[model samples]
Target: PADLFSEDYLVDTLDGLTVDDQQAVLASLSFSKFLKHAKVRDWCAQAKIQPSMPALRMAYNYFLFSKVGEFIGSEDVCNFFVDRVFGGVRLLDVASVYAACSQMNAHQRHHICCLVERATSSQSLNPVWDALRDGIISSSKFHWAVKQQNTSKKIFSPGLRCEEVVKTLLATLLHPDETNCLDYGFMQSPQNGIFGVSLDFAANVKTDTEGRLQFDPNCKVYEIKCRFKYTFAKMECDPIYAAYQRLYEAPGKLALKDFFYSISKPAVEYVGLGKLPSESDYLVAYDQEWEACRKLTPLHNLIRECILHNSTTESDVYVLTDPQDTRGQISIKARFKANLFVNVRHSYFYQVLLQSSIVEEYIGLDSGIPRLGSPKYYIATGFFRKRGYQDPVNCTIGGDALDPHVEIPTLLIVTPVYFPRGAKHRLLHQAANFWSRSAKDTFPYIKWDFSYLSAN
Candidate 1:
């Protein structure tokens, strides 16, 4: 049904469209404040605010009157996704979704703090938060920096298009694999590789089906294990940092030529463990170990042992992927085992769901990750497998943003990867590394991967 190429829908969504043009328009939905004073702008900024209801209602009223049925009655699109994927599309659910997204964002931000600690052996949260918060704010700031009344001026709004790039990268990297239709070459750029990370079986036992890593109604503690894997492009030393910069520094876009043009350098340098250069120093390193580090070794094993040995309950673990990959390129596969003592009561799943939604929003993935339709609208369906990309529907509508869909199963193990501009890829390890060093403890299990590693 979402097949945009169909004759019925192709006329408006496809005809006369170039990839770049499509990307450009999609980029504008959030970046363009050219209409800052316009009603659309007003609603977007205030959309989260309670007071914005008046503006929202007004826009709805205007759309209905103008006979733009597409815009007026389209709220169902959001509702449809909410229902199909999440099981319900209540207004409160929307708010919950926003909150979940925020929680994930906070965790990611906290993760940055972890990176800073790993790099500098500093455990304080301030510096990491400062670095990430600055980046988060910069995306919007950079939006207007590139655009002018005259489109002729170096148009930079939408900044580096990092969100789109990351989304594209993620979609390609985390596609379903059962279909065997996804080809990595389609998603691969000369300097970029797409890949995914998932919790292994042992790790899954610790992850709650509801998707939160916390105490439940039963007051039982759960372990949430995760893994990631990604390939590197030869052009940049710190592909991960480069990815983050693309989205963070220029989410708004201004004088971004320097950032965009700087991609030619190879290998982001690492002065020491966990320390990568900043944009000011991003290209300075000539030789580097971009994807070299590990804390997962023991962490992985610890999770495994917890699941296989100490756990008293039987675990239900599965490795699942989407049934199809729309592009006939790129696919996803995950393997993990999990066992959690879930409390039938006390909305823990919902709490984690809320947090997971926040994480997506913070990285701009809430709208950035590729779904089927327009950039203005789309939805992520399920757990991103480590390898494979075949079924688009496997992406499903809703389950847990952090976890996969009801239809989808938990993984036994996962390996994460980062795009050329992904913030998490570059920063998470660094953060974890920071934690190890600051505590003067080594997480031997956390091994860095230079290539994709498949485990049984």
Candidate 2:
């Protein structure tokens, strides 16, 4: 029992004990800065070891490790006595590890020693050394490296090449008499300074005699739509484009075609109505075919009468199609009530323009103005494929099978919806109540007091 309490006896036992046992005894002495012989003796008894394990040796080692940099006392002594002699040439030197470990508390010092041992042995601090070597180099080369990557990808990449091809194709498709003018600039709204829109390209405009610049009042704003595979399917066979063709040609034709197929052909012959025209006649004038349909007979007569008078539809729905397919074949159709030719106002463009003064002042008030009733507003559109490209709904005819090589190109459609002039502006002011108000507020305009009384 006296031998178990002896400092030399416990020290010899700990020297042969496993690492786990040494760690267990070492933790017990971690709080103490010094390991006196008597203190170690008292700890062994308190731990209740009976002359078998090497508790004293573990306690001595814990104290030895904890007191490593204690001799330095402070940073001034470390710099003057140790660092000044080494001249910073050593890796993991006694002074360097001492300085690093001393700055930390007791618990941190133990863990850091473990990390240092691992770094020198199996960990192979090669990667860390490499990072230190590279990080110390100049940053001018770093900035140049980043700039080169961005410029090469943006200016010379395949994507930019694709956009150039689309531009050339559009230019080739322009009419021989018409010139394709590439125009782009930001213009501020004269009436409201806050609003602005950009131009990509505009086709068919009067240029300076040298072809340096082009701007014309009568020039058509040709918005180009480019189709890659993704968007081609959507615009192709778009019902709206087809519907416009049907509605523009003969409002009666749409109604007539629907009615003709539903009823029996023999029944029509017996009823004394003539035969229906073929598909070729559907896009052209087919008054006779519309007359044969009993269901849409009244509708046929109304569209006919509306065509004679001045009728117009205000809309912002504009997309370029194959010029050959849509050239003279597209127009709006509305039904007539009595002698009044009702104009259909889809107002897709009008809604955006009326809310802001930018587009309104540009087309409506400025420029070499067309007459009050004449068509003057022209929104030019251009298509380009690149960043921030919004590919519109595919409205092209035919599905994905036909155009395998096509890519959906992004489109830019510009329309110039000018403010109404003269009587038109006056009427808009009168209709101001209907602008942003609810139906209840506008009910008075719709409902007029027509009641009268007769006295006896």
Candidate 3:
């Protein structure tokens, strides 16, 4: 009788049960409260006689979570629908669930908003936008960039929308030609394994090229920056360029520091690298603190022991009085190495760079003097310029290297010109302003301010 309720056993036996037996089992469980809605009630009632696999699985999930509490956490519920029903949440699924969870509490709304905030893909955002538009979820409840305390009535800022448009334009324009010859995806920072960046497009060494873009030994990271005609003329005045510099320049240099520090560490035994300086001599810049504190023998022993011994989540707590105030006590945690650095070099995204000759050419173009040194890893900022309203002849801008305050001397700026008459121009506009038509009346404040240059 006890084994009958077990997950594996019940899954196998549920199909064999008669209608009466199935109804009796359902009656025995406290899942009747979940069938308040007519649709869900009918959905469950229809399946009671001979429940499908998915239906059975849903029942199991309800039973498993309900045993611990009255209802599953709202975030988990969203995740449940994503994983169980669709295998991944689509725009329609988000709408259907929001409608179905009509009796959901305020707690559920907040939790769902948090879940949506973490969503990285535009596909997921489509449903969220739909929900916001339909008034299923308030714009304040589930916005992407809005912080918890600073919830705004507005869905998204005009600036963010413009950036999204530019990104969309670049992606759409590049996909046809780029997808055929180049591989594309996120690239992780080479310095630390912690951060990853999604390039507008990426091409590898072996990729087929139309000669528009080229890579040398490694691969290339391309970013698209779209500016209006007037903005392009006074490009330095545009705040977006400054914003990019603020966001990326410091981080880029920090990554360089970390990259150099990483190679300076003695190679862990069995990890397979001959000596630290000998093998990693090419990568320069070592922290003085590392030179003083590094104990190669201890590091080797720690790694060796960790490999030999299996680890667990077991914790040891200690209470110690402050030396300054003997009566003041605090709990201190001493944890063993649980997380280790992921080898960036081994990662597929890390090796993406230009050929040595191409890199030198770019460096020479930027610096005016061709650099004859080991390649420095830096993010390439591609400035994409479209035909302005008044410009007569298309002008090409030479690549420039700007270091701001950081030692990131490797930053390369490349400008690519676009014509207003191009077929891709309309496509770029359409892709960039996806929500423009939908929200024209509802959100009149959101001015789709893209300047389309006339071919005539």
Candidate 4:
């Protein structure tokens, strides 16, 4: 079968060859580079293939840097590169990828450091590494494109210098045994309704070179994403306006909320327990009703005292008549040990007083409870609704029902929770949970709606 030049026979050349045939053929020709192939190297060495020594030396060097040294490679990092970058199961291009890593900046380099550290220490590698590594390596294609488009001397793409960045990232990832790294969170603004990350954490993650990695020679590359909190809880940052490096990374929803609140404590303190102008002015008619609610507060405390005393009947449920509900008999009132109002004064809320048009600049959940449903007289305020064409909205009683059943026509009413804010005519829809809204930019306005439930 002397058909080395025949394409048809070449396809079948690997089959039906005796050991002697193979030996004779191998001995006849030069197969110099065959042993160096990564996949082939391992198998050929196991089968006692000839001249496997060079591959063994190179492989041994790689292992020495990895295993014997403190910076041993993690299974996670390996899986990350193979599966994500190289398409490990699919035969990815690794050397080309390495070529790109050589140009990383100090910030990016430090990030790689964190990544390596986490990979090495954690029992399992994070899937995020794969996405990041591949992302950095793949971006090199655009470096040349960007340079051509702009004559400015500044370097536009980091992938061109990826090697330095990747190295730095690896070193930083492995440096810290434990992190004092801050928790960063992003919150949406009331205006745009989009979330933005805080500045403090952004500065921590990024370097002068637009890199966010920290480095350590003894560690693999590490990366720290957004874990910092905003400086103010109530205010929102504009994520869209910030540069990619400046933008904050949000943790999960609950974690982000906690982080946001921690930074916002100061802002909350600025708002004292005093009645918000809107609530204050609106509740003038019902100042006496709050006394009844105050009584409930003690009843709530008594239940708590009973619990501490290990008393049996600490919880009491009673129907609160709205004075108007005397006929229908449906009311929501209960007494329990946990109904504590310790931080009542400091709650965030709008304070409107003496039927004034002035509303609190910003109100939060800490504002006092609603006075609309008080057994006392109706609450009134100067806050108005949009009228036909040019007419002004007039001051009105807070608890007055728009309709005419007339018993509580004075307006002791509560709206649904989860209602939308900033609606023109949906004031009543938010009557119950109205305290949740903040009056930062403008005074609260009211509108008339027919049958809608809540905004949520």
- Which prediction has the highest TM-score against the true structure? 2
A best-first ranking of the candidates according to their TM-score comes to 2, 1, 3, 4
Q: For candidate 4, lDDT tens digit of each residue in 1-456?
A: 222112233214434788566434322211112112343334443333322111222222222112212323344433433344344442223233332232222233223333343442321132222212210101121222121223332111111122222222222322234332222211111111111111111111222242223211111111111111221121135331122112123213222223223332211111122222121111111122222112324424422332232212121112122222233221223222211111111101111110010001011111244322211111110101111222212211222212121111110111100101222123222321221122111111212111111232
Model 2: weakest 10-residue lDDT segment is: 447-456
Q: Could you give candidate 2's per-residue lDDT for residues 1-456 as a string of tens digits? A: 112123343345456768667544433332121222344334334433222101211222223322222321212222322233235332222223323323333223222222222222211122222111111111112112222323321110003334333444344433335675543333322221112233334455443442222334444443232323222222445543344344335544343243223333311111112222222211112234433433325534432332332123322322234323332121112322111111212122222223223223333543354544322333322332222133333323221111223342233222343433342343233332221132123222222111210000
Model 4 lowest lDDT segment of ten: 352-361
Off by over 4 Å in 1: 1-68, 71-174, 178-264, 273-276, 280-456
lDDT of 4 at 422: 27
Measured on C-alpha atoms, candidate 4 has an lDDT of: 0.22
Candidate 4 versus the native: TM-score? 0.14
RMSD of 2: 32.0
Q: Write the per-residue lDDT of candidate 1 for residues 154-196, one digit (tens) a residue.
A: 2222111212222232333433221111111000000111111
In order, what lDDT does every prediction score? 0.25, 0.29, 0.28, 0.22
Off by over 4 Å in 2: 1-171, 199-201, 206-214, 223-347, 351-456
Which candidate number maximizes lDDT? 2
Which ten-residue region of model 3 has the weakest summed lDDT?
Answer: 314-323
lDDT of 2 at 57: 19
**Comparison by TM-score, 2 against 3, better one:** 2
| TM-score per model over all chains | 0.21, 0.25, 0.20, 0.14
lDDT assessment of candidate 2: 0.29
